[model samples]
Target: GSMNAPARAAAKTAADALAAAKKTAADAAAAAAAA
Candidate 1:
């Protein structure tokens, strides 16, 4: 159970980071296009 919890948490953390990074990149792209 412990290993499962960490594994799941790590996956969730990675996914959240990826989503945030994607949003940030998208924002930067939009800003560049606007400029």
Candidate 2:
């Protein structure tokens, strides 16, 4: 798989989004439990 600039950038963006989404879900759950 060639790492074309656009492809690499897209992958990073997707990864960040995935992590943010996962973290947000966990944080929300923690807040709910704390309430």
Candidate 3:
């Protein structure tokens, strides 16, 4: 199976964005706990 360059790039970009969002949410929760 082969993916074109655009498809592969798009998938990677989406994955990175999702990871960042998850990390931000976890960080926010921790900050709330410390308050």
Candidate 4:
């Protein structure tokens, strides 16, 4: 199966953004625990 280049790029961008958001939340939780 072949995928479109632009679609694939967009998917990657979305996944990366979601991953960053999750990491941001995780960091906040850790900071809260330390405070």
Candidate 5:
């Protein structure tokens, strides 16, 4: 068992948020173009 696992999870969550935001922006841009 390693104490660093929590840190890994935190970092992974951070990256997931970034990816979600990126996708959200892309989707918005496409929608704006369509409109």
Candidate 6:
């Protein structure tokens, strides 16, 4: 039962990283298109 605490933290970190990556990629694509 206690294992879920650490597991949830790890999952949140992973999701944040993924969202940041996606935003970075989208920004780059938009910049390229603008140029």
Q: Indicate which candidate wins on lDDT.
A: 6
* lDDT of each candidate versus the true structure: 0.86, 0.86, 0.87, 0.87, 0.88, 0.89
Candidate 2: tens digits of C-alpha lDDT, residues 1-35: 56588777779878888998899889999998999
**Superposing all C-alpha atoms, what RMSD in Å does each candidate have to the true structure?**
5.8, 4.6, 4.5, 4.3, 5.5, 5.4
Q: What is the lDDT of candidate 2?
A: 0.86
* Local accuracy of candidate 3 as per-residue lDDT tens digits, 1-35: 57588787779988898989999899999989998
Which lDDT value does model 3 have at 21? 91
Clash number for candidate 4: 0
Report the CA-based lDDT of candidate 1 relative to the real structure: 0.86
Residue-level error in angstroms, candidate 1, position 17: 2.0
Question: Residue 31 deviation, candidate 4, in Å?
Answer: 1.0
Lowest-lDDT window of 10 residues in candidate 4? Answer: 1-10
Q: The CA-based lDDT of model 6 is what?
A: 0.89
- Alpha-carbon shift of residue 27 in model 2 (angstroms): 1.1
> Best TM-score goes to which candidate?
4
Write model 6 residue lDDT over 1-35, tens digit each, in one string: 95798778889989888989999899999988998
TM-score between model 3 and native: 0.39
Which residue pairs show backbone clashes in model 1?
A: none
Give the alpha carbon lDDT tens digit for every residue of 1-35 in model 5: 65688788889979888999999889999998988
Displacement of residue 28 (Cα, Å) in model 5 is: 1.4
- Quote each prediction's TM-score: 0.39, 0.40, 0.39, 0.41, 0.38, 0.40
- Residue 1's lDDT in candidate 2: 56
